[PDB]
């Protein structure tokens, strides 16, 4: 079945967009909360899209499953820890994962999200529970696990917060800063909570990563790139829009963080119309293969490399390079990303 059946790298993934259903359940009887349903797939049909939707439309996919986890310690270290098991089924050797954690808190953070009593779980110990959980799920199913933490758009007053977070942290497991949720905000790139928490991420050596492009024009690229300072792109794919931005990113081997069936699941591609990727290919650009959101969008790693092997003619050879681009673009020290390269090429051969 599987279109790619060699080990595989990945950048871009969201922890809060991968739970199991079935633990959403668990955890919905057992504090109280309740879902609009009670079978584990029920629960993914209505939990989860098969065709395009709204931002509104997709961000109450969050508001039924998010009081589930948020909140309580041994749902995020679950999660965690059942990612990595996930990830082991995709035949992934290496994965970051990211996730905002003021977002999984409910204590120390203004607004308290998703409606939510107040409570004790703070931002910095759902980054501790994250982290374990992960550890765990390196050492029992053999996939290497890094984190990324976000940072949220409209909100730029958590973001010193993030910047701390990712230092406090560092190595072990997060290795970098992103930024995300709704690029479409006027100006949010250039939020000085932001910006200042992207100049601290430069001054002590934390990795950077920007949502930008996928939704939004070429210029929120630009700023990702010119202010923000990124060393990859989530998605990216108007800076086409642009061909000397383009053309410049192509000059530096700037790293895209492709999702292809998201983008067609959010609306960011139309189906009817070049998908970047497949320019991507032809131009030989830096660029990865990546989920999203596999709760959500229905989806495992193999239905990114099957719509394209099916739908755009990808071969094997394009697989293994990308994977390589991945695992060189990967925010690991660069002795583990030797390693990483070497693992990949002798399963290449
Ligand atoms: N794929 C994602 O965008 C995503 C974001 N998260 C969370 C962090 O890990 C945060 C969820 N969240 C909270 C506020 C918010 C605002 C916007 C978005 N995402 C977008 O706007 C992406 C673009 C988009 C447009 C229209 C439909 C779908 C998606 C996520 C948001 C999980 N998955
Ligand atoms: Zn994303």
């Known amino acids: 079945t599987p279109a790619f059946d060699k080990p595989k790298v990945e950048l871009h993934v969201h922890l809060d967009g991968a739970i199991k259903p079935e633990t959403i359940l668990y955890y919905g009887k057992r504090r109280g909360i309740a879902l609009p349903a009670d079978t584990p797939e029920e ?3 209505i939990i989860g899209m098969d065709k395009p939707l709204t931002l509104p439309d997709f961000l109450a996919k969050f508001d039924y499953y998010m009081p589930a986890i948020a909140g309580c310690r041994d749902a995020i270290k679950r999660i965690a820890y059942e990612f990595v098991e996930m990830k082991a089924k995709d035949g992934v050797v290496y994965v970051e994962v990211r996730y905002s954690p003021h977002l999984l808190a409910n204590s120390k953070v203004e607004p308290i999200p998703w409606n939510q ?7 910095d110990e759902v980054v501790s529970l994250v982290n374990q959980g992960l550890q ?11 984190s990324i933490l976000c940072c949220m758009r409209h909100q730029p007053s958590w973001s010193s917060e993030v910047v701390e977070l990712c230092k406090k942290y560092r190595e072990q497991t997060v290795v970098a800063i992103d930024l995300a949720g709704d690029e479409t905000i006027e100006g949010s790139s250039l939020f000085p909570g932001h910006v200042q928490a992207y100049a601290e991420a430069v001054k002590s050596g ?5 949502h930008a492009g996928e939704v939004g024009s070429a210029n929120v690229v630009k700023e990702a790139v010119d202010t923000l300072k990124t ?12 061909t000397t931005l383009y053309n410049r990113l192509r000059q530096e081997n700037m790293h895209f963080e492709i999702c292809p069936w998201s983008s067609y699941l959010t609306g960011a591609w139309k189906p009817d119309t070049e998908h970047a990727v497949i320019r ?6 830096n660029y990865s293969l990546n989920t999203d959101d596999p709760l959500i969008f229905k989806s495992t790693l193999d239905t990114d490399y099957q719509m394209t092997k099916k739908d755009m003619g990808f071969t094997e050879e394009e697989f293994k390079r990308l994977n390589i681009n991945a695992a060189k673009s990967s925010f690991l020290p660069e002795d583990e990303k030797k390693e990483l390269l070497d693992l990949l090429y002798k399963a290449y051969r």
Do not use: C, I, W
Not at 117 to 123: K, N, R, S, V, W
Not at 231 to 242: M, V
């Open 231 to 242: 060393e990859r792109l989530g998605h990216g794919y108007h800076t086409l829009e642009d």
């Open 136 to 146: 765990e799920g390196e050492r029992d199913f053999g996939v290497k696990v890094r």
């Open 280 to 285: 991507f290919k032809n131009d030989q650009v």
């Open 117 to 123: 009593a107040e409570g004790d779980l703070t931002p």
């Open 43 to 45: 629960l993914q049909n």
């Open 206 to 210: 934390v990795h950077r990563t920007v």
